[PDB]
């Protein structure tokens, strides 16, 4: 009748009801996305509100079982997941306004359009900028968005920041950015605690270690874009923001077509082989299944194949379709896809199935801890499945890539450049954005200066200068869905570092030699068991320890990043010895 025993009884009851109630919600959500009906909306709304009320009531009851009196540790951790007040401390009018402003910011972002020289930014205008060859159109697009939508999001963004900070104080944190940093804290461990401040410091020190690859990559990208538009871009100055081809600044995938090392060199693309071989999209999914069995991970359940809906709904069911992996509870695992016979769908299939390998292993833990070690692990492990899907060893052994293919170092460079530009080019962006959001929530920077600070950070950290000056009314970061919405960007950076550290840990278990991008994880059942040992732990074990058992380090290292792109880093250095390295932050189209 003490706190630990009553806590044990309480959580077991919660886990049973939680499995049934979340399942009802997850079913309603799946069925709705599969078939859009008025009834499915009511099922989503009823299951969601009942489940939410359930969670709020159980959190309130959780509060009567103090964490500091419990010696069991497992229930302690489950209570820590449940104890956070959330909206229960925040004043009712502030909570109502916070939910209203979040819904409003999402609505404006997704419904506000940029009128052509009207079009929605996501994906329309971004696709046009990515495919357009006229930098003046990209420049116009950036100014037009700020004029048409940025003015709608700014005053609400400022209020949103204040309301989230108020909630953060209600939750006993300095600001909402700190609240997000708190997702990475652990306690009750043998020297594995990381503080929020340490998480920030670790990111900045890691960037100092990353910088040589970023600068050599950037110097290459900047010089190539300069050669593409030599009458506008300075040979010394940094690149203009509109040239990125991504209004958000997150994806540098839209510069690749201008920075191609050799116009005549292909990237690996096995779409033609699948079509010529008449393979079904569900067969490339079955081949991914064979890969997972070969690694040494559990085989896929029949329930997945029967419950999953892998093909596009087409014109039969009104539907919303995108790749995503679902865990509905009680052993019900499924994937929603718009599958196509193409290499992009294959790598996505590996990403989403890997997410189910994890949900299948997470099922060993109680529902409330039935999650990954941290926020960034799910995508990072899906990316681990993607990296092994991308290497030519995997594709050649399956038969997607021609049996007569031989490595061509310049082709490997073209692949590595495209991959580094997407994966690495985004890293300092993600960092300056998370850090900007953190300073914005903290309140250290006045609201009007925030736009200056964003412009300065783009120039100082990534070598990106806004081609057009903007006032306080316009808001540049709000062009990204996740900035207007409630989203922490620390996890994308963290996911990628986990991703490269994993590729190295599994490469070492696999006992492969050569560049880390050459190294695969197919077969290599030592790597399978090594990975299986963490998958089964998920959120229940400290995430720092959960990774430590695999990677062999107290924290994450950059080294696997350089190993993956080692031939690219070497090539970039060889060209950069002649080109200008670094960038001037004084040059600006504005100036």
């Amino acid at each position: 009748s003490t706190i630990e025993e009553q806590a044990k009884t309480f959580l077991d009851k919660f886990n049973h009801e939680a499995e049934d109630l979340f399942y009802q919600s997850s079913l309603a959500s799946w069925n709705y996305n599969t078939n859009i009906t008025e009834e499915n909306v009511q099922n989503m709304n009823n299951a969601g509100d009942k489940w939410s009320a359930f969670l709020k009531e159980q959190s309130t009851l959780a509060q009567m079982y103090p964490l500091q009196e419990i010696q069991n540790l497992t229930v302690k951790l489950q209570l820590q997941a449940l104890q956070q007040n959330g909206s229960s401390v925040l004043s009712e009018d502030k909570s109502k306004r916070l939910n209203t402003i979040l819904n409003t910011m999402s609505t404006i972002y997704s419904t506000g359009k940029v009128c052509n020289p009207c079009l929605l930014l996501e994906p329309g205008l971004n696709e046009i900028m990515a495919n357009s060859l006229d930098y003046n159109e990209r420049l116009w697009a950036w100014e037009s968005w700020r004029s048409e939508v940025g003015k709608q999001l700014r005053p609400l963004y400022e209020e949103y920041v204040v309301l989230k900070n108020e909630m953060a104080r209600a939750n006993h944190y300095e600001d909402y950015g700190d609240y997000w940093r708190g997702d990475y804290e652990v306690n009750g461990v043998d020297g594995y605690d990381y503080s929020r401040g340490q998480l920030i410091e670790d990111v900045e020190h890691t960037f100092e270690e990353i910088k040589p690859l970023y600068e050599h990559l950037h110097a290459y990208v900047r010089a190539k874009l300069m050669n593409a538009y030599p009458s506008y871009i300075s040979p010394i100055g940094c690149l203009p923001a509109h040239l990125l081809g991504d209004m958000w600044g997150r994806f540098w995938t839209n510069l690749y077509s201008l920075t191609v090392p050799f116009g005549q060199k292909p990237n690996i693309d096995v779409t033609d082989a699948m079509v010529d071989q008449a393979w079904d999209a569900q067969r490339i999914f079955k081949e991914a299944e064979k890969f997972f069995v070969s690694v040494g991970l559990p085989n896929m359940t029949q329930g997945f194949w029967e419950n999953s809906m892998l093909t596009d709904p087409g014109n039969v069911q009104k539907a919303v379709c995108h790749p995503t992996a679902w865990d509905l509870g009680k052993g019900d695992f499924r994937i929603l896809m718009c599958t196509k016979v193409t290499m992009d769908d294959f790598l996505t299939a590996h990403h989403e199935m890997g997410h189910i390998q994890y949900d299948m292993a997470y099922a060993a833990q109680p529902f409330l801890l039935r999650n990954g070690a941290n926020e960034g692990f799910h995508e990072a492990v899906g990316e681990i499945m993607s990296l092994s899907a991308a290497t030519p060893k995997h594709l050649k052994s399956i038969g997607l890539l021609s049996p007569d293919f031989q490595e061509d170092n310049e082709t490997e460079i073209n692949f590595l450049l495209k991959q580094a530009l997407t994966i690495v080019g985004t890293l300092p962006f993600t960092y300056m954005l998370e850090k900007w959001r953190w300073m914005v929530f903290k309140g250290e920077i006045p609201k009007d200066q925030w736009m200056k600070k964003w412009w300065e950070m783009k120039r100082e950290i990534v070598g990106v200068v806004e081609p057009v000056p903007h006032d306080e009314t316009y808001c540049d970061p709000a062009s990204l869905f996740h900035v207007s919405n409630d989203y922490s960007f620390i996890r994308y950076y963290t996911r990628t570092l986990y991703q490269f550290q994993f590729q190295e840990a599994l490469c070492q278990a696999a006992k492969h030699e050569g560049p880390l991008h050459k190294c695969d994880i197919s077969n290599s059942t030592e790597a399978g068991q090594k990975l299986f040992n963490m998958l089964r732990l998920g959120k229940s074990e400290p995430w720092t320890l959960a990774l430590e058992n695999v990677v062999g380090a107290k924290n994450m290292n950059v080294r696997p990043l350089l190993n993956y792109f080692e031939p690219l880093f070497t090539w970039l250095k060889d060209q950069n010895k002649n080109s200008f390295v670094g960038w001037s932050t004084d040059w600006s189209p504005y100036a």
Binding site: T9, F10, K13, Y23, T301, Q302, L328, K330, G331
Partner: protein, 50 residues
């Protein structure tokens, strides 16, 4: 407590987790039995068996 061999306990009395006397359901008072959710979509370990 645990059952004896072949014992069939069919009691429906509410179990109280704490010391506070409790009648009916409540914050720390729970019905001893729970239902199983059986659906054609649940996984192999969750499906009903005869």
């Amino acid at each position: 407590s645990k059952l004896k061999p072949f014992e069939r306990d069919i009691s429906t009395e509410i179990y109280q987790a704490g010391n506070k006397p409790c009648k009916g359901k409540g914050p720390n008072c729970y019905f001893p039995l729970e239902s199983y959710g059986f659906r054609p979509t649940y996984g192999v370990g969750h499906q009903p068996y005869r």
